[PDB]
Design a protein around this ligand. Structure first.
Ligand SMILES: *[C@@H]1O[C@H](CO)[C@@H](O[C@@H]2O[C@H](CO)[C@@H](O[C@@H]3O[C@H](CO)[C@@H](O)[C@H](O)[C@@H]3O)[C@H](O)[C@H]2NC(C)=O)[C@H](O)[C@H]1NC(C)=O
Ligand SMILES: *[C@@H]1O[C@H](CO)[C@@H](O[C@@H]2O[C@H](CO)[C@@H](O[C@@H]3O[C@H](CO)[C@@H](O)[C@H](O)[C@@H]3O)[C@H](O)[C@H]2NC(C)=O)[C@H](O)[C@H]1NC(C)=O
Ligand SMILES: *[C@@H]1O[C@H](CO)[C@@H](O[C@@H]2O[C@H](CO)[C@@H](O[C@@H]3O[C@H](CO)[C@@H](O)[C@H](O)[C@@H]3O)[C@H](O)[C@H]2NC(C)=O)[C@H](O)[C@H]1NC(C)=O
Ligand SMILES: *[C@@H]1O[C@H](CO)[C@@H](O[C@@H]2O[C@H](CO)[C@@H](O)[C@H](O)[C@H]2NC(C)=O)[C@H](O)[C@H]1NC(C)=O
Ligand SMILES: *[C@@H]1O[C@H](CO)[C@@H](O[C@@H]2O[C@H](CO)[C@@H](O)[C@H](O)[C@H]2NC(C)=O)[C@H](O)[C@H]1NC(C)=O
Ligand SMILES: CC(C)CCC[C@@H](C)[C@H]1CC[C@H]2[C@@H]3CC=C4C[C@@H](O)CC[C@]4(C)[C@H]3CC[C@]12C
Ligand SMILES: CC(C)CCC[C@@H](C)[C@H]1CC[C@H]2[C@@H]3CC=C4C[C@@H](O)CC[C@]4(C)[C@H]3CC[C@]12C
Ligand SMILES: *[C@@H]1O[C@H](CO)[C@@H](O)[C@H](O)[C@H]1NC(C)=O
Ligand SMILES: *[C@@H]1O[C@H](CO)[C@@H](O)[C@H](O)[C@H]1NC(C)=O
Ligand SMILES: *[C@@H]1O[C@H](CO)[C@@H](O)[C@H](O)[C@H]1NC(C)=O
Ligand SMILES: *[C@@H]1O[C@H](CO)[C@@H](O)[C@H](O)[C@H]1NC(C)=O
Ligand SMILES: *[C@@H]1O[C@H](CO)[C@@H](O)[C@H](O)[C@H]1NC(C)=O
Lengths: 105, 253, 30, 119, 114, 284, 119, 28
C-alpha cells in the first residue's frame, strides 16, 4: 500500500489518515495531531519502519512502509589514483622520518 | 425556473457546524449540484443529489432534498478555514427540453481559524534594492481584530489573509501595508483600525543569538574533501617538522 | 546541525598530539 | 518483517529482497516494470539482487517493491521509499572510522621508531 | 527560441551542486556533444545530463542530437568562488603574521645550523 | 475532463479572437458562460449535439460552431470594450448522471489602445530580524506593482522547485489610483519559513511572476519596449547576518588550506636543503 | 564556431562578441534589450564589447546574446549562459595560479637565508 | 571554531619550541 510521505522544508514527515505504529528505527517526534509523524531533518539520514491503517475503501487494511534515506554528508571524492597518491605520500614521509632517526642513532 | 440561496454571506469561527439552504420555484427537476469557487480558478463540485434520492453524503458534507417542500440543505461538520469559498447551487429540469441549468446567486463563506496563542506585533521589512518603497507587517493578531484602509492615497494597506504552515501545523493572520513617500514609520501606519494595546512594537535596535544560527549549519562533500586535505597537510607538516628538528640536532651536535 | 565529518572534534584532535605530549615532557625540568 | 537489504558501491546500487525464498521475482518502481528485460545493460536482475549502474538521485528515487512473479501490483503491502545521493567513487565513512587511521598511522610509526633506534 | 532551435536549456538551481541540461528532442534517441565530439548517450527514461558540481566551474560548448541536424551550441560559462578569497584586512593581517613568524623560525634554524 | 485555451488574452478594440474548448469523454452537451463581477452569471450559446445550435441569453457578440463533438470553439469576430469578462466552458453527459464538468476558465480584456498596458515590476523583501528573534519564524513578502491588465500569475520557487506550503497570495489586486480608471494594479504575496531554514545560505528563494500580454503579431509603435507575454522573477539568498555560517566556514577553511601549501613548500624546501647537506656529507 | 570571449576585472565585467564583424552589434539579456546610451552609468557598450560595472549575481546572471543590427536576436546562431558571483578585489586561486605563489616564496626566502648563512 | 583551533595549535607550537631549546641547551 502507498504510505504518503512529504519533504517540506528540509524536514521529512509521514502522513496517514490514522495513527502511526512504530517499528525499529528513528522514532522522531509527533506533531499536534497524532495522524502526522515528524522524522526530523532530511540530512540526518532518517531510517525506520512504520505502520498505519488507511480509511474508506482500505479499512480494514494493514500497511507497512520502509524509509531509507542515504545522504552523503559523510562522503568524500577520491579516484583510486588520488588514493594511491595519499598512501604514497605517507609512506615516503614515514621513510623520511625513519632515515632521520637513523642519522640520530 | 429560479434559484435563491439564503444567506448570501456568512462568517463563522472554525469548528462550527454550518447550515446552508438552496431554494427553487419548480419541483419538476432531475439534478442537483453544489459547486465550489475560490475566488475563480474554475468551479469544483463534490456532490450529486438525484430526484430519486433523499440524502447524499460524501466526506464531511451532508446534503438533503425536499421536492415537496421545495427546499435543499447542505451541512458542514467541523468547519475549517479551508472551506472559505463561494458555494453554488444548480438545478436542471426534469423534462427532456433544453437541459439548461439555472444557477443561483451564490453564497460566500469565510471561516476564521482559532488562534491558540495570540501575539500581535508590527515588524518592518528592510527595503530591497531597485525599490523606493517601505513595507511593514502586522501579524499574529486575534481573529476578532481586523483592519481597514488608510486615510491617504499614498499609503496602500492590504486586507488580512490566513496562512497555513504544514511543517509546524500553524495558522496565522497577517496584513501588509506599504507607502512610497515621507515619514512612513509604521508605528503610525496602522492607524485607521483599532489594534490591541498589547501589540508588540520592536525597537529599531537589532539583536540575535549565534546559537540559533548554528542550528542551520550543513555540510557538503567538497567541504569534507577539503577538510581531509587540511588534516593530511597537518600530518605531513608534523612529519617534516620532526625530521627538520632532528637534522638541526644532528648538525649542531 | 549536521557536521558529517566536518565535526569540530577533528579540529581539536591533532593538536592533542602536541597537547598531551607537551604536558608530559614538561617534567624534564622538574 | 524482514527489512530490504540495500548496498551502495559507488554509483552502483544493489537491491536485495529476501522476503521470499525465490524461484520467482519481479520488481516495480514508480508504477512501471523495471528489471524485467535484458535489452538495457544499465540495469540487471540477479537471482536475489537487482543491480543499478550510475544511479541518479533526482529521477530514480521513489518507491520500490517486489511482486513477485505472478503477483499483481495492488496486492503489495510493504513498500520501500528510497532517495539517496551518490557520486562516482563516493564511499561512506563516519567520524569514528576516520579517527582510526590517524591513531594507527602514529602506531605504526612507533613501530619503526623502536627498531631503527636499536641500530 | 525553439523556432531558432537553441534546443539546449539548463536546469541550474538545485540543493546540491549538480548542474543539469535539458534537451527537448523526441524520446527515441538522445545523444550529447561537447565541443562537437561524442561524449555520451542518454536513454529515454533518463531526461537530464549531469556535469557534476558547479564548484568544478563547468564552462564548455554543448549541443544535443534529435531527429533533425543537431542543436544550436550553447556556451555555458560558470565562474564560482570555490576559490575567491575576500581580501579583508583581517585576512591579509593573518597571512602576514603567519608568514613573518614562519620566516622567523627559518631564520632561527639557519642561524642555529650555520 | 474539460480543457479550454488560452488562460489570458489582451485584445485591441476591433480585433478578432477565437477561444478553443475540447473534451475527450464524448460529452454531448457543451456550453459557455461569462461571469461579471458581482451581478450574476450568464449563459452563451450551447450545443447538445453535433450540427445543432441554440442561442444563449447573451447571444450578441459571440459565435460558435459544432463540427466535431470533441471540440467546441468560441469566436469573437469584433472585440468591444464591454466584452471584458471571465469565460468558462462546460460539458456534460445527457440524462445518465446529470453531472457537470467546468473548464479552468479564460480571462479576456479589450482595450481602446494598447499603449496603456505595462509589464509588472517584481520586488522581494527579506524578513525583519525582530520577527525571527521573537517568533523564531521568517516571513518573505513579494510585491508585484504597477501593471496592466491583471493577467498575472505568481508563484514561489525554492532550490529550483515550486512550493505550495506556507504561501499566501492576495486574492484581489490593489489599484495604485482607485479614484479613476484605468489604473495600474499592485499585488502582494507572503511566504513564511522556519528560522532555521531561512538562515541557510544554500537555500535560494525565488518569486516568479508570469505576465500574459501582447503577441509577436501585435503592432507596436510606442517609444517604449513592446510588452510581450513574458515572465518576471526576483531572486533572494538565505542569510543570517549575525553568526557563523557555512560561507564563513568555506572561506576560512580555504584560506587555511592555502596557507598550508606555502607552509608545506616552506617545509619541503628547508628539508631539501638540510637533506642535501646530509647526503653530500654521506657521499663524501 | 568561434566561442564568446569573457573578461573579468573585479566588480567590472566586460564581454566580447567576436562574431558578426563590421556590422552594428546589439545585445539582449533575459530576453530584454540592453546596451549603452545614457539610461544607466553602470553599463556601457563598445564597438564589439559590452561592459558591466559593479556586477551583481542576483539580477545579472542569466542568458546573454549578441546579434547584428536589423537581424532578429532570436535568429542568432548562438546563445550564452553566464553565472558568476562577483567579488570586489577578490583574486582567485586557480590550480595553475596557486602554483605560482609557492615558487615566488623560495625566491624571496632564498635571498635572506644566505646572508644570515654568510653572516 | 577553526581559527581558535589554529591559535591553540600555534600556542602549543611556541611552547614546544621554547621547551626544546631548553633541554637542548641544558644537556649539551
Ligand atoms: C487517506 O484519506 C484520503 C481522504 O479520504 C484518501 O484520499 C482519497 O483517495 C481516493 C482513492 O482512494 C481518491 O479518489 C480518487 O477519485 C478519482 C476517481 O476517478 C481519481 O482521481 C482517483 O483515481 C481516485 O480514485 C480521492 O480523491 C482522495 N481524496 C478524497 C478527499 O477523498 C486516501 O486514499 C486515504 N489513504 C491514504 C493512504 O492516503
Ligand atoms: C490498525 O489495523 C488493525 C487491523 O485490523 C486494527 O485491528 C487490530 O488487528 C489486530 C490484528 O488482527 C488484532 O489483534 C488480534 O486480535 C485478536 C484477539 O487477540 C486475535 O485475532 C489475535 O490474537 C490478535 O491479537 C487487534 O485486536 C485489532 N484491534 C482492534 C482494536 O480491533 C487495529 O486496531 C488498528 N490500529 C489502530 C492503532 O487503530
Ligand atoms: C456569427 O454570428 C453572426 C451574428 O452576430 C452571424 O453573422 C450575421 O448573420 C446574419 C444571418 O444570421 C447575416 O445576414 C443577415 O441576413 C439578412 C440579409 O439581408 C438580414 O436579416 C440582416 O440584415 C443580416 O444581414 C449578417 O450579415 C451577419 N453579420 C453581420 C455583422 O451583419 C454569423 O452567422 C455567425 N458566424 C458564423 C456562424 O460563422
Ligand atoms: C435553513 O434551513 C433550516 C432547516 O429548514 C432552517 O431551520 C428552520 O428554521 C425555521 C425558521 O426559524 C424553524 O421554524 C425550524 O424549526 C428550523 N428547522 C427545521 C428543521 O426546519 C434555517 O432557519 C434555514 N436558515 C436560513 C438562514 O434561512
Ligand atoms: C540510441 O543510440 C544509441 C547510441 O547512442 C544506440 O545504441 C548503440 O548504437 C550504436 C550505434 O549504432 C551501436 O553500435 C550499439 O551496438 C548500440 N548499443 C546498444 C546497447 O543498443 C541505440 O540503438 C539508439 N536507439 C535506438 C532505439 O535506435
Ligand atoms: C603549526 C605552526 C606552524 C603554527 C600554525 C600556523 C598559524 C600561524 C596559521 C595556521 C592557520 C592560520 C589561520 C587560518 C585561517 C585564518 C582565517 C582568516 O580569515 C584570517 C587568518 C587565519 C586566522 C589564519 C591565521 C594564521 C594561522 C593561525
Ligand atoms: C610544521 C612547520 C610549518 C614548522 C617546522 C618546524 C621547525 C621550523 C622548528 C621545529 C624545531 C625548531 C627548533 C628547535 C630548537 C631550536 C634551538 C633553539 O636554541 C633555537 C630555536 C630552534 C633552532 C628551533 C627553530 C625552529 C624549528 C627548527
Ligand atoms: C447526514 O447524512 C447521514 C447519511 O448516512 C445521515 O445518517 C445523517 O442523519 C445526516 N445528518 C447528520 C446531522 O449527520
Ligand atoms: C471588522 O471588525 C468590526 C468590529 O468587530 C466588525 O463590526 C466588522 O464587521 C468587521 N469587518 C469590517 C469589514 O469592518
Ligand atoms: C514615489 O515617490 C517619489 C518621491 O516623492 C515620486 O517622485 C515618485 O513619482 C513616486 N512613485 C510613484 C510610482 O508614485
Ligand atoms: C493616528 O491616530 C491618532 C489617534 O489614534 C491621531 O492622533 C494621529 O494624528 C494619527 N496619525 C498619526 C500619524 O499618528
Ligand atoms: C537536418 O538537416 C538537413 C539540412 O539540409 C535537412 O534538410 C534535413 O531534413 C534535416 N533532417 C535530417 C537529416 O534528418
Amino acid at each position: 500500500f502507498k504510505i504518503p510521505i512529504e519533504e517540506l522544508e528540509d524536514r521529512v514527515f509521514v502522513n496517514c489518515n490514522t495513527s502511526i505504529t512504530w517499528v525499529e528505527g528513528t522514532v522522531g517526534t509527533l506533531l499536534s495531531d497524532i495522524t502526522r509523524l515528524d522524522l526530523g531533518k532530511r540530512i540526518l539520514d532518517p531510517r525506520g519502519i512504520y505502520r498505519c491503517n488507511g480509511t474508506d475503501i482500505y479499512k480494514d487494511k494493514e500497511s507497512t512502509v520502509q524509509v531509507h534515506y542515504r545522504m552523503c554528508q559523510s562522503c568524500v571524492e577520491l579516484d583510486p589514483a588520488t588514493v594511491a597518491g595519499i598512501i604514497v605520500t605517507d609512506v615516503i614521509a614515514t621513510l623520511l622520518l625513519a632515515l632521520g632517526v637513523f642519522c640520530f642513532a | 425556473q429560479e434559484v435563491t440561496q439564503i444567506p448570501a454571506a456568512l462568517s463563522v469561527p472554525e469548528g462550527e457546524n454550518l447550515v446552508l439552504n438552496c431554494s427553487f420555484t419548480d419541483s419538476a427537476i432531475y439534478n442537483l449540484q453544489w459547486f465550489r469557487q475560490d475566488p475563480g480558478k474554475g468551479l469544483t463540485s463534490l456532490l450529486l443529489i438525484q430526484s430519486s434520492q433523499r440524502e447524499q453524503t460524501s466526506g464531511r458534507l451532508n446534503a438533503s432534498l425536499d421536492k415537496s417542500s421545495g427546499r435543499s440543505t447542505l451541512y458542514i461538520a467541523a468547519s475549517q478555514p479551508g472551506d472559505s469559498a463561494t458555494y453554488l447551487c444548480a438545478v436542471r429540469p426534469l423534462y427532456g427540453g433544453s437541459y439548461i441549468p439555472t444557477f443561483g446567486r451564490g453564497t460566500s463563506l469565510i471561516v476564521h481559524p482559532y488562534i491558540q496563542n495570540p501575539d500581535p506585533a508590527v515588524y518592518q521589512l528592510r527595503d530591497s534594492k531597485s525599490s523606493d518603497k517601505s513595507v511593514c507587517l502586522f501579524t499574529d493578531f486575534d481573529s476578532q481584530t481586523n483592519v481597514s484602509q488608510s486615510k491617504d492615497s499614498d499609503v496602500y494597506i492590504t486586507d488580512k489573509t490566513v496562512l497555513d504552515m504544514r511543517s509546524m501545523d500553524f495558522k496565522s493572520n497577517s496584513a501588509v501595508a506599504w507607502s512610497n513617500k515621507s515619514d512612513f514609520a509604521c508605528a503610525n501606519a496602522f492607524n485607521n483600525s483599532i489594534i490591541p494595546e498589547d501589540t508588540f512594537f520592536p525597537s529599531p535596535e537589532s539583536s540575535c543569538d549565534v546559537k540559533l544560527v548554528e542550528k542551520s549549519f550543513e555540510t557538503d562533500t567538497n567541504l569534507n574533501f577539503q577538510n581531509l586535505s587540511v588534516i593530511g597537510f597537518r600530518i605531513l607538516l608534523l612529519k617534516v617538522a620532526g625530521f627538520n628538528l632532528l637534522m638541526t640536532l644532528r648538525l649542531w651536535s | 546541525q549536521s557536521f558529517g565529518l566536518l565535526d569540530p572534534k577533528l579540529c581539536y584532535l591533532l593538536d592533542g598530539i602536541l597537547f598531551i605530549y607537551g604536558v608530559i615532557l614538561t617534567a624534564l625540568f622538574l | 518483517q524482514t527489512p530490504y537489504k540495500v548496498s551502495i558501491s559507488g554509483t552502483t546500487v544493489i537491491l536485495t529482497c529476501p522476503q521470499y525464498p525465490g524461484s520467482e521475482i519481479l520488481w516495480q518502481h514508480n508504477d512501471k516494470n523495471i528489471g524485467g528485460d535484458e535489452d538495457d545493460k544499465n540495469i540487471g536482475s540477479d537471482e536475489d539482487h537487482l543491480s543499478l549502474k550510475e544511479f541518479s538521485e533526482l529521477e530514480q528515487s521513489g518507491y520500490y517493491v517486489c511482486y513477485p512473479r505472478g503477483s499483481k501490483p495492488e496486492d503489495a503491502n510493504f513498500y520501500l521509499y528510497l532517495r539517496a545521493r551518490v557520486c562516482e567513487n563516493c564511499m561512506e565513512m563516519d567520524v569514528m572510522s576516520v579517527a582510526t587511521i590517524v591513531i594507527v598511522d602514529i602506531c605504526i610509526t612507533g613501530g619503526l621508531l623502536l627498531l631503527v633506534y636499536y641500530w | 527560441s525553439i523556432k531558432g532551435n537553441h534546443l539546449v536549456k539548463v536546469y541550474d538551481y538545485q540543493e546540491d551542486g549538480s548542474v543539469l541540461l535539458t534537451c527537448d528532442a523526441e524520446a527515441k534517441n538522445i545523444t550529447w556533444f561537447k565541443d562537437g565530439k561524442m561524449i555520451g548517450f542518454l536513454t529515454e527514461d533518463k531526461k537530464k545530463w549531469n556535469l557534476g558540481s558547479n564548484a568544478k566551474d563547468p564552462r564548455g560548448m554543448y549541443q544535443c542530437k534529435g531527429s533533425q541536424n543537431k542543436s544550436k551550441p550553447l556556451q555555458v560559462y560558470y565562474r564560482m568562488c570555490q576559490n575567491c578569497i575576500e581580501l579583508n584586512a583581517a585576512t591579509i593581517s593573518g597571512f602576514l603574521f603567519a608568514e613573518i613568524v614562519s620566516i622567523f623560525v627559518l631564520a632561527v634554524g639557519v642561524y642555529f645550523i650555520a | 475532463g474539460v480543457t479550454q485555451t488560452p488562460k489570458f488574452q489582451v485584445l485591441k478594440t476591433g480585433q478578432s479572437m477565437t477561444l478553443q474548448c475540447a473534451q475527450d469523454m464524448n460529452h454531448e452537451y457543451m456550453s459557455w458562460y461569462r461571469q461579471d463581477p458581482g451581478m450574476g452569471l450568464r449563459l452563451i450559446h450551447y450545443s447538445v449535439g453535433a450540427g445543432i445550435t441554440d442561442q444563449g441569453e447573451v447571444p450578441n457578440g459571440y459565435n460558435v460552431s459544432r463540427s466535431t463533438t470533441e471540440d467546441f470553439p468560441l469566436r469573437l469576430l469584433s472585440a468591444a470594450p464591454s466584452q471584458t469578462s471571465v469565460y468558462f466552458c462546460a460539458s456534460s453527459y445527457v440524462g445518465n448522471t446529470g453531472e457537470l464538468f467546468f473548464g479552468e476558465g479564460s480571462r479576456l480584456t479589450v482595450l481602446e489602445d494598447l499603449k496603456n498596458v505595462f509589464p509588472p515590476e517584481v520586488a522581494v523583501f527579506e524578513p525583519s530580524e525582530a520577527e525571527i528573534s521573537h517568533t523564531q519564524k521568517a516571513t518573505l513578502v513579494c510585491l508585484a506593482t504597477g501593471f496592466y491588465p491583471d493577467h498575472v500569475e505568481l508563484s514561489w520557487w525554492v532550490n529550483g522547485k515550486e512550493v505550495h506550503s506556507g504561501v499566501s497570495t492576495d486574492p484581489q489586486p490593489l489599484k495604485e489610483q482607485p479614484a479613476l480608471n484605468d489604473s495600474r494594479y499592485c499585488l502582494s504575496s507572503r511566504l513564511r519559513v522556519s528560522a532555521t531554514f531561512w538562515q541557510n545560505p544554500r537555500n535560494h528563494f525565488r518569486c516568479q511572476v508570469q505576465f500574459y500580454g501582447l503577441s509577436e503579431n501585435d503592432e507596436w509603435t510606442q517609444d517604449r519596449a513592446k510588452p510581450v507575454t513574458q515572465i518576471v522573477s526576483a531572486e533572494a539568498w538565505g542569510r543570517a547576518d549575525c553568526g557563523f555560517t557555512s560561507e564563513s566556514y568555506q572561506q576560512g577553511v580555504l584560506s587555511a588550506t592555502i596557507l598550508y601549501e606555502i607552509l608545506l613548500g616552506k617545509a619541503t624546501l628547508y628539508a631539501v636543503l638540510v637533506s642535501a647537506l646530509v647526503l653530500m656529507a654521506m657521499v663524501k
